[PDB]
Design a binder for these strands. Structure first.
Lengths: 71, 76, 74, 75
RNA sequence: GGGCCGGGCGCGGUGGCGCGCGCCUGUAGUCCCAGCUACUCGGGAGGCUC
């Protein structure tokens, strides 16, 4: 669904051109909410969460994307 | 500012600790060349970045992963 | 005319002074016993007026003066 | 007749003090002819002075303090 | 010797500049200090480029 779908689209952008896209990650402890975004300055794909169970997957999606950049 | 593998992690821990009351902690990941990736962190005042290569990704990701998981416990 | 907000009157006044930095003049009248201030900027043909009894304004004015006093001296 | 910048500020402070009980202070500002003439009166007594670029600094802060502290009656 | 080392909105500060707070958002590519004293004009150290 939303998250499972989202990642797909993102990993689609990373592959389309892994040299023009980047991935932001905004943690706002106070208001209490996380926010992942993968853009190519021609495609704003963003995902926000506030629930706690969502950190783990967001962090993994981050750690991974990094590995494809260093592979 | 560009730091060395370690340094970056300690500065980063602070960014979270220096924002637990307010403000947002940014982090952007990126494929870099001119194999490595560019890692940046900012609280809006102080900036910091590092360059992670395939040679240390395992060792770095070990601590980086604990760091993100521990400092980000504050959501719903 | 008189104005209901310092915002308007300010530029209104500043602009007016600007279009003739030689005839224009600004006067201020404070009556402690009645508890009110009153700024007016004239051209001896045109007249702007601001009246207040809110302390929140004394600074806005002391500033305006300090502002007009800058143009007159540059 | 003009008064020395400093003196001016003292007489002015005094005008305000005399007009507290029941009276009014008038202060007017106009380009002198670079300088700018500054005058103030309570109706009868009249004081004036000229402030230049040479003196705007010491004067503005002083003048600023004078206006702020002496206009208190408001809401 | 000259240009550049981030941009945006809101509030605050000062006559004004530097400046403070909040939020948003970039690059391969910023740090430090409070100062200037009528002034669209504070000071030091690095790096890039004509």
């Amino acid at each position: 669904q939303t998250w499972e779908e989202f990642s797909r689209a993102a990993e689609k952008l990373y592959l389309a051109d892994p040299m023009k896209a980047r991935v932001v990650l905004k943690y706002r402890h106070s208001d209490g909410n996380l926010c992942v975004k993968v853009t190519d300055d021609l495609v704003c794909l963003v995902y926000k969460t506030d629930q706690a169970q969502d950190v783990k997957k967001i962090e993994k999606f981050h750690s991974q994307l990094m590995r494809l950049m260093v592979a | 500012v560009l730091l060395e593998s370690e340094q970056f992690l300690t500065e980063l821990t602070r960014l979270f600790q220096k924002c637990r009351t307010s403000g947002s902690v940014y982090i952007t990941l990126k494929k870099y060349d001119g194999n490595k990736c560019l890692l940046r962190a900012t609280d809006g005042k102080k900036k910091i970045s590092t360059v992670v290569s395939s040679k240390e990704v395992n060792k770095f990701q070990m601590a980086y992963s604990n760091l993100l998981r521990a400092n980000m416990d504050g959501l719903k």
